[PDB]
Ligand binder design. Structure first.
Ligand SMILES: CC[C@]1(O)CC[C@H]2[C@@H]3CCC4=CC(=O)CCC4=C3C=C[C@@]21CC
Length: 246
């Protein structure tokens, strides 16, 4: 299984937020630790993406673009998996040093968004998602959001996305109507990530705009992305690719 061998080999290790778990929880400190973790994760998502099979087939500009547009969804999806494996989805395992209990969901003022993320985490349990299905789904998620008017070289992208869908189907058939109900389940789960990412895009965008006054810090790399790429998505210029009607 050359494909799966590669996916495990390139999977990022643990990433820490650097949070002070000794301080009392507060809005500014929690959101500032999440933003720092987001910057750290982004660095890892780029190295991970660039090591994926066939990634260099994409035009150089298209490579960074798909990474910037899918960053949020990719973070949420992997965070949902970590929460599942580490705490059976009972809390949101953003990092070993930044685990959100219900009190933190509330103090971060991201309660409703955390509910949606924890629900996603529970679905890894309900559907009995295997670590290999998770790896394949997460790679495909990178190729699931594009400009309405297309990429610099859309044909290379369409071929790469087609191959990752086929690999997902393959890992399925290896042990299998059954396959079909399974492919249906996994594609529905992939789609469900998009609305969650859209809520988080709205939330981080609104926070960036008022960040001067709510004392929340945004590292340079993302503030760039949040003010330049995220608005393209929120204004409908860049849209997710759904398997099913929405
Ligand atoms: C105020 C936190 C916030 O801006 C809002 C939503 C946050 C997302 C939520 C999803 C996520 C999952 C992770 O495993 C790492 C960090 C991570 C974020 C960091 C900062 C963000 C996005 C850049």
């Amino acid at each position: 299984p050359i494909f799966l061998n590669v996916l495990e080999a390139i999977e990022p290790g643990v990433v820490c937020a650097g949070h002070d778990n000794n301080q009392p929880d507060s809005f500014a400190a929690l959101l500032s630790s999440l933003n720092e973790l987001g910057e750290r994760q982004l660095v890892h998502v780029v190295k991970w993406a660039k090591a994926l099979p066939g990634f260099r087939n994409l035009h150089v500009d298209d490579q960074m673009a798909v990474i910037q547009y899918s960053w949020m969804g990719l973070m949420v999806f992997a965070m949902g998996w970590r929460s599942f494996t580490n705490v059976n989805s009972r809390m949101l395992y953003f990092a070993p040093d930044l685990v959100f209990n219900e009190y933190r969901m509330h103090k971060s003022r991201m309660y409703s968004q955390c509910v949606r993320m924890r629900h996603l985490s529970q679905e890894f349990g309900w559907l009995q998602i295997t670590p290999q299905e998770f790896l394949c789904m997460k790679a495909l998620l990178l190729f699931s959001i594009i400009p309405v008017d297309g990429l610099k070289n859309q044909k290379f992208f369409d071929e790469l996305r087609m191959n990752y869908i086929k690999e997902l189907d393959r890992i399925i058939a290896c042990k299998r109507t059954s396959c079909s109900r399974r492919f249906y389940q996994l594609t529905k789960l992939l789609d469900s990530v998009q609305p969650i990412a859209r809520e988080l895009h709205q939330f981080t965008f609104d926070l960036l705009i008022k960040s001067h006054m709510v004392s929340v810090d945004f590292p340079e790399m993302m503030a760039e992305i949040i003010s330049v790429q995220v608005p393209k998505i929120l204004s409908g210029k860049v849209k997710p690719i759904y398997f099913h009607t929405q």
